[PDB]
Amino acid sequence: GMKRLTYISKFSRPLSGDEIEAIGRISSQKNQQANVTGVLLCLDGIFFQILEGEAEKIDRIYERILADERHTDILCLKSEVEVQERMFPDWSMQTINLDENTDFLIRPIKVLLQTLTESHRILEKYTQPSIFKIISQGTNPLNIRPKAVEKIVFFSDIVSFSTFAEKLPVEEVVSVVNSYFSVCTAIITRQGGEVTKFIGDCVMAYFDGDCADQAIQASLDILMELEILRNSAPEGSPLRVLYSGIGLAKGKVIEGNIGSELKRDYTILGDAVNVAARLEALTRQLSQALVFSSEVKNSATKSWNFIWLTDSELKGKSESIDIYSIDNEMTRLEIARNIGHYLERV
Amino acid sequence: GMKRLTYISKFSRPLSGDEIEAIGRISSQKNQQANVTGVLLCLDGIFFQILEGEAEKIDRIYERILADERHTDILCLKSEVEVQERMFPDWSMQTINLDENTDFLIRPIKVLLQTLTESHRILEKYTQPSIFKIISQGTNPLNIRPKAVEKIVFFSDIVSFSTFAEKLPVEEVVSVVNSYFSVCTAIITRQGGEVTKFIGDCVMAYFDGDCADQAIQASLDILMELEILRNSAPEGSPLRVLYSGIGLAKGKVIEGNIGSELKRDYTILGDAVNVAARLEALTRQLSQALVFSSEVKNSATKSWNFIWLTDSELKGKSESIDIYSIDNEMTRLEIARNIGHYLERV
Ligand SMILES: Cc1cc2nc3c(=O)[nH]c(=O)nc-3n(C[C@H](O)[C@H](O)[C@H](O)COP(=O)(O)O)c2cc1C
Ligand SMILES: Cc1cc2nc3c(=O)[nH]c(=O)nc-3n(C[C@H](O)[C@H](O)[C@H](O)COP(=O)(O)O)c2cc1C
Ligand SMILES: [Ca+2]
Ligand SMILES: [Ca+2]
Ligand SMILES: [Ca+2]
Ligand SMILES: [Ca+2]
């Protein structure tokens, strides 16, 4: 059946009007051979494209388009599955270069398009990466039916964050937290997790319920990167005393259209506050940078060097759960007093 | 000096092409008298408008436009202060009805505009209301300089949320949490607070540091509305056993461009996790639906019926703070066992 994608992208490099003409002419030739139709517009370094045709052919062309080095920041705004008729039946690929168009009525429209796209790019930064994935799969996020799914939940925090905020100017605190968040988000994403929110200095993320190995690997990689960061920072850098505690648990997450008219969310983990606070307490109490429950340990498939540490309570239920870590050089209140002294004289 | 606003809105009711023509012609006449210029476009029940002129005149016209009943859901996409020249010097108000336009090149552009606007409306639901306010004030949220500001922080949660998730189908859990979030968000917003995030079943919100009375009033109103909700729900409704604990504290919030390339936030309250967990523990330990610190109590100006309850620790620092509530009929583990029995047989 027929599929129609709409996406926007950014010129990765300046492109002349003749290069854009060539892109359109090659696309028209290739699309004609594939029975694909659509339209390509450019304006001030932005591409807009609509492609329609057999789902199979569309997905293969779009993969090729994703790899084309001449644009970047590809965002699919809309994916329509089960499309009934073509919008552009006579256009294998029609190319409309708006930079070159001087028509009277199109001038205000170009301003509007530019403004909508730019506002769209701002909003893209402040939205959960996971809404865009639902869109790309062809569903309106506001119309998802609720579902409960087991996840591995990741929480990490900054040791003695309050000391940073007390001892450094706000711009330096923000530089520290942004380095932290950048390290965590990059590694979690590369291991297939999704960061769902920042709660103060705490990063909250999900992994699929059978992806314990990926969650553990991501945790170890974060610890290794922070060690590299502390060692390699300039003399006197506040980054030298950036440490993190990480906890992993298993939870039942609800996915759906959650919230109010004023604010929506895609997912809810009930009592997230309490699980995170209990895991931060464990990492301090055990002086262990990584702790996780037996449920996480039992969902793993690789032969990790597990070490049993203690019993604890993670959910408000009075169930006593075994807490494990990984026994390696990395993982092998203390840090808080060191933090303050160092930050005092930098 | 000169200001230029761009906004989109939705037809509140169907409007004929002649009514849109009349809006444009009255606007052109009024704007000419005010030395304001711009353009108005409509497409499939959406208005787009750009207005430019003296900041003073622009703000007064825009107020009038906000009150016009013929459209709703006004969203300012861009506000430019210190505008150097006019984009539409010869158009007091030019009206472009895109529904009526059959031009060859404009047809794909209408599709694109529709898709950008619709995707924009989805993203609007999932974004902090506060980014839109920064935009309306004429600043790019990604370019704000970091600032530390004292706030009253509000945390509320659902008593025994886990029992709902254990005993009810997921669609009913979502209906319960959405009723909760809707009540909280409406009342906090009406009292001038901003909801910044949902953390599981916990609502996190800010009030200005000298707006303790508004935070306390909002808390009391939420408790009163939940009581009305429990009493007025259908027989057997899970809403009959929806209860909330609320805690208020004072904190130093950092506002700025926080996060990573993959995910941004506007504000960070360090150790938010720990303050919220400690306040939920207080509401259960004291069997009091509303607790707040002495700092909140001392920031209030009205003659509230304060009652001292206990000492507690809210920040990880070993400082012992007096905890207060309000002594009234409303505010005057217990509920958890009742919850489970009721939900068991509904
Ligand atoms: C904005 C943009 C849109 C494109 N659209 C199409 C298209 O619709 N169809 C197509 O075959 N190639 C399109 N291309 C080019 C592909 O990325 C690729 O370069 C081209 O199809 C050559 O593919 P090949 O590796 O099979 O030779 C587009 C490229 C860009 C930058
Ligand atoms: C989409 C839309 C755009 C409007 N734009 C303008 C405008 O640019 N200038 C203006 O004076 N009135 C504009 N109006 C109408 C005002 O809302 C208001 O009805 C009109 O200015 C009459 O104002 P009055 O109360 O002073 O008579 C617009 C109305 C709508 C629905
Ligand atoms: Ca912390
Ligand atoms: Ca045990
Ligand atoms: Ca709770
Ligand atoms: Ca005391």
DSSP B165-201: HHHS-HHHHHHHHHHHHHHHHHHHHHTT-EEEEEETT
Tell me the shortest Cα–Cα distance from A340 to chain B, in angstroms. Answer: 13
Q: For the domain with range B141-344, which CATH number is right: 3.40.50.150, 3.40.50.1100, 3.30.70.1230, 3.40.47.10?
A: 3.30.70.1230
Closest CA to B77 of B38, B24, B132, B119: B132
Q: How far, in Å, is the centroid of ligand 1 from the Cα of B51?
A: 39
Residue nearest to atom 13 of ligand 2 (CA): B27
Residue A292 DSSP label: E
Name the residue among A122, A200, A316 with its Cβ closest to that of B270. Answer: A200
Ligand 2 pocket, mutate which of B27, B61, B76 (most atoms under 8 A from CB): B27
A277 CB neighbours in chain B (<8 A) are: 273-274, 276-278
Residue A142 burial (CB < 10 Å; 0-12/13-18/19+)? middle
Distance between CA atoms of A238 and A171, rounded to whole angstroms?
12
Instruction: State the nearest Cα–Cα gap between A107 and chain B, in angstroms.
Output: 10
Distance (Å) of CA A47 to CA A40, A41, B221: 7, 6, 50
B70 Cβ below 6 A of ligand 2: yes
CA A322–ligand 4 middle distance (angstroms): 5
Q: Please provide the size of chain A in residues.
A: 346
DSSP H or E stretch at residue A176: helix A170-190
Q: Which of A8, A105, A150 to mutate to test the interface with B (most CBs of B within 10 A)?
A: A105
Distance CA A264, CA B72 (A): 20
Q: What is the dihedral of CA A15, A18, A22, A25, to 10 degrees?
A: 130
Dihedral of alpha carbons B173, B175, B179, B185, sign: positive
Mutate to test the pocket of ligand 1, among A23, A29, A70 (most ligand atoms within 8 A of CB): A23
Helix (H) or strand (E) holding B312: strand B306-312
Cα–Cα distance, A117 to A48 (Å, whole number): 10
SS3 B91: coil
In chain A, the residue whose alpha carbon lies closest to the alpha carbon of B143 is A122
DSSP code of residue A206 = E
Q: What is the number of alpha carbons within 13 Å of residue B55 lying toward its C-beta?
A: 11
A2-126 against A141-344: fold identical: yes
Sheet holding B2-11, edge to edge: B71-83, B2-11, B46-54, B37-43, B94-97
Question: Which two tokens mark B118?
Answer: 């619709």
Residue B21, phi then psi, degrees to nearest 5: -55, -40
Phi and psi at residue A251, in whole multiples of 5°? -145, 165
Record: contact B165-A126, CB cut-off 8 A: no
Atom of ligand 1 nearest to the CA of A29: 11
The answer to whether the Cβ–Cβ distance between B186 and A129 falls below 8 Å is: no
What is the number of other CB atoms lying within 10 angstroms of the CB of residue B195?
23
Is CATH 3.30.70.100 correct for B2-126?
Answer: yes
The CA distance from A33 to the nearest CA of chain B, in Å, is 22
Whether B31 lines ligand 2, by a CB cut-off of 6 Å, is yes
Nearest to B74 by CA among B10, B134, B3: B10
How many angstroms separate the CA atoms of B154 and B249, rounded?
7
A138: left (phi over 0), alpha (psi -120 to 50) or beta: left
Atom of ligand 2 nearest to the CA of B29: 11
Pairing of strands A94-97, A37-43: parallel
Domain ranges across chain A? 2-126, 141-344
Ligand 4 centre distance from Cα of residue A312 (Å): 8
Total beta-carbon pairs less than 8 A apart between chain A and chain B: 285
Residues 6+ apart with CB under 8 A from A95: A20, A21, A23, A24, A25, A27, A28, A39, A40, A41
Residues 6+ apart with CB under 8 A from B102: none
What is the H or E stretch that residue B52 is in? strand B46-54
Nearest ligand to the C-alpha of residue B320? 6
Lookup result for tokens 């108000």: B93
Contacts of residue B228, defined as CB under 8 A and 6 or more positions apart, other chains included, come to: none
Buried residues in B101-123 as b, exposed as e (16+ CB within 10 A):
eeeebbebbbbbbbbbbebbebb
Q: Determine the residue among A88, A147, A268 to mutate to test chain B binding: the one whose Cβ has the most chain B Cβ atoms within 10 Å.
A: A268
| Dihedral sign of CA atoms B288, B293, B296, B297 in order | positive
Q: Dmax over Cα atoms in chain B, in whole Å?
A: 74
The Cα–Cα gap between A162 and A166 comes to 6
* A58: Cα within 13 Å, side-chain hemisphere: 23
Nearest residue (by CA) to ligand 2, atom 10, is B27
Residue A83's identity, in one-letter code, is V
